[PDB]
Every structure is written in C-alpha cells, then in structure tokens.
C-alpha cells in the first residue's frame, strides 16, 4: 500500500503531520494563552508592532511594519482563533 494511504488508515494521522512548526507560536495557542486575560489586545498589539522575545522561547519577533491600528486588528483576529 502507498504510505500516504497507510499514514491515514493506521491512525498515524491522529498524531503526526509532515511539516514542522514555524518559529513563532501557533495563533490557536496565542488565543488560548491570552483568553480572558485583561489587556490582551493592547499587550499583543504592542508586541506585534514593537517585537519581543522570551515569552514563548528565545527566538525574537522582529519589530513589524504595521500601523498601531493594524497591530490592534491583528491582535483581535488572533485572539478570535478559538
């Protein structure tokens, strides 16, 4: 049988995928961490624009080319992924 087929029908698909995780946190995980956390939108908007490090690992997010309004919109969207 083809491995792609076995990968699905023998349950491997419940626990494994092909591609590695990207360097930053998954947005679903960001949403979960900050749900109900007071000031999450403004906190995250600040991090998106300014960059930062140390919350999820030692790899930094560089400062991002977004307006304050865009940073807030992006924070709000990320927090909705739940």
């Amino acid at each position: 049988e083809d491995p792609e087929v076995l990968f699905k029908n023998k349950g491997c698909v419940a626990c494994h995928a092909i591609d590695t995780k990207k360097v930053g946190p998954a947005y679903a995980d960001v949403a979960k961490k900050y749900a109900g956390r007071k000031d999450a939108v403004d906190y995250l908007a600040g991090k998106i624009k300014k960059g930062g490090s140390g919350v999820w690992g030692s790899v930094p997010m560089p400062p991002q080319n977004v307006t304050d309004a865009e940073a807030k919109q992006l924070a709000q969207w990320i927090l909705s992924i739940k």
Partner: protein, 80 residues
C-alpha cells in the same frame, strides 16, 4: 484580519494551528539523516512504540506488519 496577516508576512513565522502530539515527519527525516541503520530502527519504533526521543509522551505500538513498518519508515526518511 487573516488577509492582513497574510499580506504583512506574519504567516512566514506563525501557523494557525498547534502542532500534533508527535514529531513532524520532515523533522524525523532530518534527525535520522546520515545515521546508520535508520530504516530498520524506525520500522521497529513504528511497530513497537518508542519513548524519550522527542518529549515526555511515548508513542504506543502500532498495528502494522513488518512490511508496512518498513514502507512507512522509508517514506518518512524520504521527506525532504
């Protein structure tokens, strides 16, 4: 929104979804690259389960034949 995130390059460094509990096959292929006996060792781990390699959660045995385990091992190690 999602479209703004894509345009701004955010998705280069961020996935929408969390990782699965086990390691990604492209990472397994890279880890075993240039290791003697990789194919046979991986077939055994797929069949019999394994632990302590990637994290604290073991992989249980899988109900695969010897031939199926070898096929899967070779396919995993080829993911480039």
């Amino acid at each position: 929104n999602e479209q703004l995130a894509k345009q701004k390059g955010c998705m280069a460094c961020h996935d929408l979804k969390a990782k699965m509990v086990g390691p990604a096959y492209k990472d397994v292929a890279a880890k075993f690259a240039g290791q003697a006996g990789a194919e046979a060792e991986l077939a055994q781990r797929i069949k019999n389960g394994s632990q302590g390699v990637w994290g604290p959660i073991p992989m249980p045995p899988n109900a695969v034949s010897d031939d199926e385990a070898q096929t899967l091992a070779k396919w995993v190690l080829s993911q480039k």
